[PDB]
Amino acid sequence: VNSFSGYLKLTDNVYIKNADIVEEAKKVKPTVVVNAANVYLKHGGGVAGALNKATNNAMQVESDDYIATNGPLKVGGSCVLSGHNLAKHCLHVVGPNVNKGEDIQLLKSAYENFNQHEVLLAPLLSAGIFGADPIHSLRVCVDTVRTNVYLAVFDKNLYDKLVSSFL
Ligand SMILES: Cc1noc(C[C@H]2CCCN(c3ncnc4[nH]c5cc(F)ccc5c34)C2)n1
After folding, report:
1. What are the pocket residues of ligand 1 if the criterion is a CB atom closer than 6 Å to any ligand atom?
2. How does it sit in the membrane?
3. Which domains are seen in the chain, by residue range?
């Protein structure tokens, strides 16, 4: 038993809720919150800009030091950094950005990073401003992640759509 509430169960291990991941994170304090990161960890908008804003820019400061030391992430890759006031840890995962022409097949590789963590609060990777179809993202998620994932979907309309179309 864990502290996530109001989730609909899609599979043995995947759950989903219409929620703001920032507010979901500040209430739950999960062990891991996933950020929808880019390879530069520049948290300007979308989920990343919202998570970063909620940390009062501390996420960005930490991220800039990470990049200065290690260089950019790979598309499909990830790093574990602090969760600041939102979670114990933040798993920054780089899904492909369709609006940059990145290969959607890398979406499976991106979701594989979730398997290194027993429980995660996460957004749908490559959705929103990353330009992929969220219904496809949820499918890859279900078919790739084996650990327990709690998906927060900010938009009530898309959420209804993801549930109603789920196979
Ligand atoms: C790059 C990239 N690749 O995929 C994705 C998926 C995103 C897209 C935009 C919606 N995102 C969220 N998801 C859950 N909660 C949220 N609160 C938010 C608050 C905001 F001000 C903006 C966004 C979210 C949000 C998911 N972005």
Report:
1. 20-22, 36, 46-47, 50, 95, 123-130, 152-154
2. Multi-pass membrane protein
3. 8-165 (3.40.220.10)
